[PDB]
Amino acid sequence: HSSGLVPRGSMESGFTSKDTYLSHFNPRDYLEKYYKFGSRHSAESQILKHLLKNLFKIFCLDGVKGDLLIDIGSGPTIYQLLSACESFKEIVVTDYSDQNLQELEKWLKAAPAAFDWSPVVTYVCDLEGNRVKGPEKEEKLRQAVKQVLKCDVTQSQPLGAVPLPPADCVLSTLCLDAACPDLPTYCRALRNLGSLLKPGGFLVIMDALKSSYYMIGEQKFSSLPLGREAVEAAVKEAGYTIEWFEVISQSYSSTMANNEGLFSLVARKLSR
Ligand SMILES: Nc1ncnc2c1ncn2[C@@H]1O[C@H](CSCC[C@H](N)C(=O)O)[C@@H](O)[C@H]1O
Numbered sequence: 001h002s003s004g005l006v007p008r009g010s011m012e013s014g015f016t017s018k019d020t021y022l023s024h025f026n027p028r029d030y031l032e033k034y035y036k037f038g039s040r041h042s043a044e045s046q047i048l049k050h051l052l053k054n055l056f057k058i059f060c061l062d063g064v065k066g067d068l069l070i071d072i073g074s075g076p077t078i079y080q081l082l083s084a085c086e087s088f089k090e091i092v093v094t095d096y097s098d099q100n101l102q103e104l105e106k107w108l109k110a111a112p113a114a115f116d117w118s119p120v121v122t123y124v125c126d127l128e129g130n131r132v133k134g135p136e137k138e139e140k141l142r143q144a145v146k147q148v149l150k151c152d153v154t155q156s157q158p159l160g161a162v163p164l165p166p167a168d169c170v171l172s173t174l175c176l177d178a179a180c181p182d183l184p185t186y187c188r189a190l191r192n193l194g195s196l197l198k199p200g201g202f203l204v205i206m207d208a209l210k211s212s213y214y215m216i217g218e219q220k221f222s223s224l225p226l227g228r229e230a231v232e233a234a235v236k237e238a239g240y241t242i243e244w245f246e247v248i249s250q251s252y253s254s255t256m257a258n259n260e261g262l263f264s265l266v267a268r269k270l271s272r
């Protein structure tokens, strides 16, 4: 009840509480704000294209492939899985928010009222060489998504008591910044995701740099404002070896975030 002075759910602890993600996170509004293919060459649209070109390169051009991929903190989105369904036989989607899981389930069932991913899907098809059209690509993704589960990156068992085989890849886009109030929790969340991975499994992360908040309309949500060095240090202390790390300077529209670019990394679960 602070009226934009401070992010929603943070007056007491300094960071957006996770119950705020069950009450004030609107899936439909988050999708309209950031994913109606951003907008007409907007900062959001350029960022989405850059995210899509990196996932295509990681999954289709590089050696990131296997049986199971677990997407962590998927929200109501599926763009991050379009290229991945080409390298992984099965995908599991997860989020802390029940309204985000409902939105994902609406898309899985191709409910007419669901969000339209068509332009994003066609862009991914174009990147992959136009071997299939959008509608064929979406059905391949829908059949590959085997489970839609509740997730909490802060718990030692992120997926609760749900048994899954060790994953070949753990993917997490624009989630860890929103979920982790500090670097010790951020480091611990990367250790928690490690328990879902086979020894030597891939960890794929894409998030924002130096961002202390992000907006969903006039609703402000916290983000951990960490830099490249702090990201690399936390990924290494969580028990991972970084294969590649990229940083772009492109930031979100001034009215939606205060970030200083984005990062992408592909890491591998260490020996121990
Ligand atoms: N502790 C927690 N554990 C898991 N997910 C969490 C979480 N706290 C927040 N989240 C989720 O983190 C997401 C931030 S939005 C990221 C959505 C999507 N992956 C994309 O690329 O746009 C939300 O869906 C929110 O529910």
Ligand SMILES: N=c1sc2cccc3c2n1CCC3
Pocket: 034, 174, 175, 176, 177, 178, 207, 208, 211, 213, 214, 222, 223, 224, 252, 256, 257, 258, 259
């Ligand atoms: N989901 C999204 S969109 C966006 C823009 C800028 C910063 C962040 C952000 N997130 C969560 C992490 C922090």
